[PDB]
Amino acid sequence: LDPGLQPGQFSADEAGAQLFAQSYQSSAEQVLFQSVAASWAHDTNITAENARRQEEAALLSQEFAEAWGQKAKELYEPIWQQFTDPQLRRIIGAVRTLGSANLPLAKRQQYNALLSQMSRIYSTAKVCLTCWSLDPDLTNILASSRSYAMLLFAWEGWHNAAGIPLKPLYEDFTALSNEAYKQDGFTDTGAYWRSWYNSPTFEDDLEHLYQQLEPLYLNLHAFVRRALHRRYGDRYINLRGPIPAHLLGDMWAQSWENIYDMVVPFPDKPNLDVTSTMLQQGWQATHMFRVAEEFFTSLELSPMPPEFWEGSMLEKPADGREVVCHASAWDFYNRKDFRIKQCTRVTMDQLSTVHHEMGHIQYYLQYKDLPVSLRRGANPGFHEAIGDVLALSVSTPEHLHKIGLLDRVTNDTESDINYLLKMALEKIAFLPFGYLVDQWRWGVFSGRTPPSRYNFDWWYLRTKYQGICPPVTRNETHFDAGAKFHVPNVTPYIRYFVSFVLQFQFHEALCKEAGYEGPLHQCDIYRSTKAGAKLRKVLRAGSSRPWQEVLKDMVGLDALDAQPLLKYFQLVTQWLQEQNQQNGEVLGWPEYQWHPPLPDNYPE
Amino acid sequence: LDPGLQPGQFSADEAGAQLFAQSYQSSAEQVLFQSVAASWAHDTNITAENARRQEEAALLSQEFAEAWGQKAKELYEPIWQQFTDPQLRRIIGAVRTLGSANLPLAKRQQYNALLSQMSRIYSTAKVCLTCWSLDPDLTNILASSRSYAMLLFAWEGWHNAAGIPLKPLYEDFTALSNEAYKQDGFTDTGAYWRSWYNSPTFEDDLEHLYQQLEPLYLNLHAFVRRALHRRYGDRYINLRGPIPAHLLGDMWAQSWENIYDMVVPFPDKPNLDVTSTMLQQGWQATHMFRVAEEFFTSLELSPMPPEFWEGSMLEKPADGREVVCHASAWDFYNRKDFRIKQCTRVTMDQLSTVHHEMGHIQYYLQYKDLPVSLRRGANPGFHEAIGDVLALSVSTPEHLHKIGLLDRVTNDTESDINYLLKMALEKIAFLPFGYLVDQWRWGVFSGRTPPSRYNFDWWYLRTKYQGICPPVTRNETHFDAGAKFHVPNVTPYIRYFVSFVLQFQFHEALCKEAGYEGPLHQCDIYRSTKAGAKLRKVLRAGSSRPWQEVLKDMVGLDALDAQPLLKYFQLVTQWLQEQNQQNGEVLGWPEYQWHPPLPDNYP
Ligand SMILES: *[C@@H]1O[C@H](CO[C@@H]2O[C@@H](C)[C@@H](O)[C@@H](O)[C@@H]2O)[C@@H](O[C@@H]2O[C@H](CO)[C@@H](O[C@@H]3O[C@H](CO)[C@@H](O)[C@H](O)[C@@H]3O)[C@H](O)[C@H]2NC(C)=O)[C@H](O)[C@H]1NC(C)=O
Ligand SMILES: *[C@@H]1O[C@H](CO[C@@H]2O[C@@H](C)[C@@H](O)[C@@H](O)[C@@H]2O)[C@@H](O[C@@H]2O[C@H](CO)[C@@H](O)[C@H](O)[C@H]2NC(C)=O)[C@H](O)[C@H]1NC(C)=O
Ligand SMILES: *[C@@H]1O[C@H](CO[C@@H]2O[C@@H](C)[C@@H](O)[C@@H](O)[C@@H]2O)[C@@H](O[C@@H]2O[C@H](CO)[C@@H](O)[C@H](O)[C@H]2NC(C)=O)[C@H](O)[C@H]1NC(C)=O
Ligand SMILES: C[C@H](N[C@@H](CCc1ccccc1)C(=O)O)C(=O)N1[C@H](C(=O)O)C[C@H]2CCCC[C@@H]21
Ligand SMILES: C[C@H](N[C@@H](CCc1ccccc1)C(=O)O)C(=O)N1[C@H](C(=O)O)C[C@H]2CCCC[C@@H]21
Ligand SMILES: *[C@@H]1O[C@H](CO)[C@@H](O[C@@H]2O[C@H](CO)[C@@H](O)[C@H](O)[C@H]2NC(C)=O)[C@H](O)[C@H]1NC(C)=O
Ligand SMILES: *[C@@H]1O[C@H](CO[C@@H]2O[C@@H](C)[C@@H](O)[C@@H](O)[C@@H]2O)[C@@H](O)[C@H](O)[C@H]1NC(C)=O
Ligand SMILES: [Ca+2]
Ligand SMILES: [Ca+2]
Ligand SMILES: [Ca+2]
Ligand SMILES: [Cl-]
Ligand SMILES: [Cl-]
Ligand SMILES: [Zn+2]
Ligand SMILES: [Zn+2]
């Protein structure tokens, strides 16, 4: 480690710790920058040379984290907890968690190589007969094809191509991660990930939320299953069994917005999927980011700086180059460079994803002047919820009208049910998946799910929560969890479940602050500088204060609460219940063993 | 209740509590007697009258615990914790746990009635094609038929006939039981059941034990699956998938000794299943119990008293009267009456069941002069292990020879493998099932497994631990867990897993104390008065002391330990590994979704 980057001496006391943290910050920005830079270079241009570079950068970071980690231990191990300065106890608390830097060098190199090989396998996998990529080709098939055999080929192809080769690496990664975090005092890596919510009752709290939300999901599921039955027939849809996992518009069945056209309650009201209009009008990626931005400035939040426009990758490269297409928002930790990397497609759901990603950037712009260790959301779920909250306003028929995407206006009970159903396809359908992913991963980290049951336990959870089944037989040579980006890329998931609850609490609060007094689901906070100021206080706080207190200042309550979500959706919750009873549906999937047959001429 | 049964007044201090506890136990014997008495009259004679009587007694019993529980909290709720006398602290801890008695009266009724209907449904269910009962007909089919289609009909018949009508009742029971135990401070009934082991780390401890044992089970499974493939063929056995749940000798696939004849590793040697010889020689139920008894008296433990021989039901009644055939051992809490109720069949596995049950009685005889509250095992696993320990000695080829059931065996490597394999079929195969039943039930009690997932979670666990699959499609109308006796009869199961480890610890201790020095698996403690004396000390102690301390005095360690089991089985564990490698077996069942097809014209 360069001399300039190494820790000096500090007193063993709180005044030393303050100088320590200032010295650290000087040197940490340079180290975070080189690492983020090498990551960007690789992810926007996957080559062996760029992967070698990212590996060395990652090793440099570990070296740093180890020297500054062991020094912070040596000097403040038994005294940091008693520091008067709360921001300082959290900075110190971060620095002395070494993570992967606890590993000896050989294992550190093995760890860094595993992350790089898993990322590469996921982001370069293809399905062939001439080969389809995930983004855009398979994405578009899952979204728009309504042919059982085509969707299946895409589903199976992807899960096989991405999952099967990840499995040996994922096992090795899991052992090393655990070894690393056990030397910071955690039983396993999952315990460390959960520690970020600083709540003793986290798992119980999540479970109590899910119990309130589950009836919504059960009713949506049944109603969608019925619409699937009418299209696909009795051979492929069991009205008392799980839904085949390739029919819901998305590779993971995680959001069902793309089958909206098959399930829309009242088809001669306004068409609320404005994708056709966007194409018809000639929208491109950069227009989508510009329109997101202008929402932010309408609140008196910050525009995207020049560095963002010059550096970002907003379209899939046409010049050959392999890239990681999975959308992401990047802080370079130099207070100057912030970028998005997205293989943006011109669709309504991508407009929402553009807002999601820009919400990440906006957080990074607002907390850029905190110490590096406090440059995070009050919890991870808060960072995931910012962009989603604005997208709630953008999605409204009134807002869409204002931005020229929805010529007709209507305010009647049918249009409202259409809108809430569309939104339930996006938000309610995701809840089970949001919850289950890290239940899977927590079991893997703890050792409850060994390699020999990775796929068995995955599908147990998928059926248990989402009420889906795999459309072809799977066995333990398959590694279907590995066909979802966040598993190989080691990104936690429970943030998204937290986010899907939190965003409705935020929405309700920002709507009331804006002076809005109509139904919660028709609120649009566009141009509300009051709403703006309230959101700004959250974004500026970073992780400098407990998330419970930041939440309480924002929404007046110190806990996750499903009530705002339930309220937003109440009309469609009631409507779906009534429809399902009148149709005589079975709620749930009591034929839990059922799987559909193979199509007759498959795949030939 | 009667006034003479309702509590006195007592000072709020340790001296009061000593008198209190004495006054409690005097009155509780009378109350336990009439309860157990009515239960007996019902189980050997299922009618509505007998059910009504049992219900009354249960109500009376709740009334008792109510009053005595109220009084114990009222008098000592703060202070009992700081009593010097540990034995007293345990008695008072128990008294203020009210259970079902926390229930309001109407729900007391309701709970008492669902038990009766669930018991009845299980024990009177039949399979018709002239109708087959579980015991003996379906038991015998599962044991000895080698026709895929007959076994299937029996398996599906039973699961459907018993399971399906239990489900609505089981749901109501579960809610009532949870409500009861929440008022004593347990999150749920499962947490109460588990409190019996007085161990913060119980669940972790069980899991750590299962991890050491699991390789043994995996090697046995693969070896047996291979044997079944040779027999049934590739259509019905997947060499990389779970074994169809009807093929292993038992309705629940829980122990596999009855397919021994199909898997025996060196077949030409003497037949270590002495069933043929027992029938040839004209053995009957009575003889089986008399031979068991005499093993106990060889140790200078107690003979069965006259009241046991006069009162017991040791055969299935031929008047036809509905009975609960499931074998059980009965303490009447009067220090006089002790009985077994068993529909005894003349087989070698029943001879072990006879010893198992007689182990319960021996316990009850040895602690009959204790305060009722100490009249249980040091933990429930202790009680389940006693008769099993003696049965391990009885099952040895040398012991069998001594009681005229087998010609002398050659003491060579092959006869040893044969024997250890038979014993693995009985003991190792049981381990997963022993562990999973209460995993299922704890999930139901905690709310993790709602009615809408009773069968899904059941089969998850079955496949996860036993590596079996249902041979016909099941859905949530089926309630396959209800087709196992202990579920409708609300009897915990984890005691059997604990027992199956404990028994090997005991066996090693008793063998060392007998002065035996050969292999663990060839020991016979028959006629060792020293071994007998050591077991007597355990049995006399009841639950007067922490099971950890009782165990330490007996065996040297203060915890459950798989090492004695591993050592008993070492030779066959090594052999099974080698067989499996040479056949190129896959250990486990990676084709986890696999289920067999239906046979051609079924039914
Ligand atoms: C779409 O339509 C709803 C319904 O509007 C109401 O019912 C219709 C059937 C007609 O009778 C309308 O005249 C009638 O307003 C609109 O929601 C309603 O908006 C108004 C405010 O804009 C709400 O009233 C306010 O109530 C607050 C206190 O809550 C008072 O302080 C205010 O003075 C004010 O009167 C009204 O409660 C609300 N109704 C519901 C069910 O929430 C909605 O605004 C309209 N939406 C769009 C997008 O135009
Ligand atoms: C596990 O499955 C693989 C993949 O086979 C496919 O998935 C199976 C679960 C089942 O649906 C099969 O019909 C599918 O072919 C099995 O390996 C393949 O086996 C096929 C056919 O048996 C064979 O032709 C291929 O070479 C194998 N590979 C591929 C690319 O399909 C595997 O044997 C199953 N069991 C185990 C333990 O992995
Ligand atoms: C049976 O023979 C063993 C010795 O032979 C070995 O172990 C057998 C179990 C069998 O598997 C053979 O093929 C083996 O070659 C006797 O064991 C010894 O006994 C003495 C006396 O206690 C003891 O000191 C030794 O340690 C024992 N050795 C072993 C192998 O543990 C065993 O006692 C014999 N018993 C009978 C029934 O004849
Ligand atoms: C597109 C989005 N991408 C993620 C990218 C996260 C990431 C972390 C670290 C290194 C690299 C990438 C994000 O921006 O949070 C995403 O994966 N998801 C999740 C998904 O698509 O699975 C859940 C989605 C909820 C709605 C908004 C988009 C959310
Ligand atoms: C036959 C035996 N019957 C049980 C009877 C239990 C019982 C408790 C309360 C009221 C009524 C019955 C017993 O003696 O533990 C039994 O069920 N099993 C269990 C079973 O057969 O499922 C597990 C067996 C392990 C070896 C010994 C026999 C064990
Ligand atoms: C992708 O990254 C590669 C590194 O693998 C970049 O390669 C450098 O590019 C130019 C010519 O292509 C040379 O001057 C360098 O010496 C290259 N290095 C190697 C190892 O070839 C490449 O330019 C990148 N592509 C883009 C468009 O950024
Ligand atoms: C549950 O299953 C019942 C019995 O048959 C089983 O399922 C049918 C569909 C066949 O596949 C058969 O081989 C199985 O053992 C059905 O009658 C019943 O409708 C099923 N569904 C429900 C909701 O109970
Ligand atoms: Ca779409
Ligand atoms: Ca989508
Ligand atoms: Ca048997
Ligand atoms: Cl997270
Ligand atoms: Cl128990
Ligand atoms: Zn995000
Ligand atoms: Zn027993």
mmCIF file of N, CA, C and O in Angstrom, chain B residues 269-272 396-399 401 406-412 414-416 418-419 522:
data_model
loop_
_atom_site.group_PDB
_atom_site.id
_atom_site.type_symbol
_atom_site.label_atom_id
_atom_site.label_comp_id
_atom_site.label_asym_id
_atom_site.label_seq_id
_atom_site.Cartn_x
_atom_site.Cartn_y
_atom_site.Cartn_z
ATOM 1 N N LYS B 269 -25.768 -67.123 4.554
ATOM 2 C CA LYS B 269 -25.477 -67.318 5.951
ATOM 3 C C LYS B 269 -26.795 -67.547 6.664
ATOM 4 O O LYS B 269 -27.822 -67.358 6.046
ATOM 5 N N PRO B 270 -26.808 -67.893 7.973
ATOM 6 C CA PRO B 270 -28.049 -68.024 8.727
ATOM 7 C C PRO B 270 -28.935 -66.784 8.685
ATOM 8 O O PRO B 270 -28.461 -65.660 8.595
ATOM 9 N N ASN B 271 -30.232 -67.040 8.719
ATOM 10 C CA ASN B 271 -31.264 -66.028 8.653
ATOM 11 C C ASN B 271 -31.351 -65.345 10.018
ATOM 12 O O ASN B 271 -31.717 -65.994 10.984
ATOM 13 N N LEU B 272 -30.986 -64.061 10.113
ATOM 14 C CA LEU B 272 -30.977 -63.359 11.397
ATOM 15 C C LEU B 272 -32.359 -62.819 11.766
ATOM 16 O O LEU B 272 -32.509 -62.267 12.853
ATOM 17 N N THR B 396 -28.761 -59.661 19.569
ATOM 18 C CA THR B 396 -27.461 -60.217 19.177
ATOM 19 C C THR B 396 -27.611 -61.702 18.851
ATOM 20 O O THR B 396 -28.351 -62.429 19.546
ATOM 21 N N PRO B 397 -26.893 -62.196 17.805
ATOM 22 C CA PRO B 397 -26.909 -63.626 17.479
ATOM 23 C C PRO B 397 -26.558 -64.536 18.649
ATOM 24 O O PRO B 397 -27.258 -65.531 18.823
ATOM 25 N N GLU B 398 -25.568 -64.150 19.478
ATOM 26 C CA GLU B 398 -25.301 -64.922 20.677
ATOM 27 C C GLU B 398 -26.527 -64.974 21.608
ATOM 28 O O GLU B 398 -26.845 -66.039 22.124
ATOM 29 N N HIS B 399 -27.206 -63.854 21.876
ATOM 30 C CA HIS B 399 -28.330 -63.907 22.815
ATOM 31 C C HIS B 399 -29.455 -64.774 22.245
ATOM 32 O O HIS B 399 -30.034 -65.565 22.960
ATOM 33 N N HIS B 401 -29.202 -67.204 20.258
ATOM 34 C CA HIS B 401 -28.822 -68.591 20.419
ATOM 35 C C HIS B 401 -29.154 -69.055 21.839
ATOM 36 O O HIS B 401 -29.649 -70.171 22.042
ATOM 37 N N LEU B 406 -31.905 -69.384 17.388
ATOM 38 C CA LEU B 406 -30.908 -69.371 16.330
ATOM 39 C C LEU B 406 -29.819 -70.383 16.680
ATOM 40 O O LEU B 406 -29.369 -70.447 17.819
ATOM 41 N N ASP B 407 -29.382 -71.197 15.726
ATOM 42 C CA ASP B 407 -28.142 -71.966 15.892
ATOM 43 C C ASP B 407 -26.911 -71.048 15.991
ATOM 44 O O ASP B 407 -26.865 -69.924 15.458
ATOM 45 N N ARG B 408 -25.872 -71.538 16.673
ATOM 46 C CA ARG B 408 -24.622 -70.803 16.793
ATOM 47 C C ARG B 408 -24.216 -70.212 15.438
ATOM 48 O O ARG B 408 -24.272 -70.888 14.422
ATOM 49 N N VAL B 409 -23.843 -68.928 15.433
ATOM 50 C CA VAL B 409 -23.351 -68.230 14.253
ATOM 51 C C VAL B 409 -21.818 -68.253 14.213
ATOM 52 O O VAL B 409 -21.154 -68.187 15.259
ATOM 53 N N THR B 410 -21.229 -68.313 13.016
ATOM 54 C CA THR B 410 -19.782 -68.166 12.973
ATOM 55 C C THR B 410 -19.473 -66.700 13.233
ATOM 56 O O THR B 410 -20.082 -65.834 12.623
ATOM 57 N N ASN B 411 -18.507 -66.461 14.130
ATOM 58 C CA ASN B 411 -18.052 -65.128 14.453
ATOM 59 C C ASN B 411 -17.011 -64.716 13.414
ATOM 60 O O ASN B 411 -15.826 -64.689 13.692
ATOM 61 N N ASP B 412 -17.478 -64.364 12.213
ATOM 62 C CA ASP B 412 -16.613 -63.869 11.168
ATOM 63 C C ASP B 412 -17.186 -62.570 10.627
ATOM 64 O O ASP B 412 -18.316 -62.172 10.993
ATOM 65 N N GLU B 414 -18.366 -61.604 7.785
ATOM 66 C CA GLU B 414 -19.608 -61.556 7.020
ATOM 67 C C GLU B 414 -20.878 -61.598 7.885
ATOM 68 O O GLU B 414 -21.866 -60.942 7.570
ATOM 69 N N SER B 415 -20.898 -62.463 8.914
ATOM 70 C CA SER B 415 -22.040 -62.542 9.816
ATOM 71 C C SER B 415 -22.156 -61.215 10.558
ATOM 72 O O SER B 415 -23.268 -60.806 10.824
ATOM 73 N N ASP B 416 -21.016 -60.564 10.847
ATOM 74 C CA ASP B 416 -21.007 -59.289 11.539
ATOM 75 C C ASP B 416 -21.630 -58.209 10.652
ATOM 76 O O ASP B 416 -22.434 -57.403 11.126
ATOM 77 N N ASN B 418 -23.723 -58.746 8.190
ATOM 78 C CA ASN B 418 -25.130 -59.084 8.061
ATOM 79 C C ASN B 418 -25.914 -58.504 9.239
ATOM 80 O O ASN B 418 -26.941 -57.837 9.079
ATOM 81 N N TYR B 419 -25.405 -58.735 10.441
ATOM 82 C CA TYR B 419 -26.108 -58.301 11.645
ATOM 83 C C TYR B 419 -26.158 -56.768 11.711
ATOM 84 O O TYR B 419 -27.220 -56.180 11.996
ATOM 85 N N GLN B 522 -21.569 -56.645 19.878
ATOM 86 C CA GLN B 522 -21.717 -58.042 20.224
ATOM 87 C C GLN B 522 -21.975 -58.146 21.728
ATOM 88 O O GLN B 522 -22.092 -59.236 22.275
#
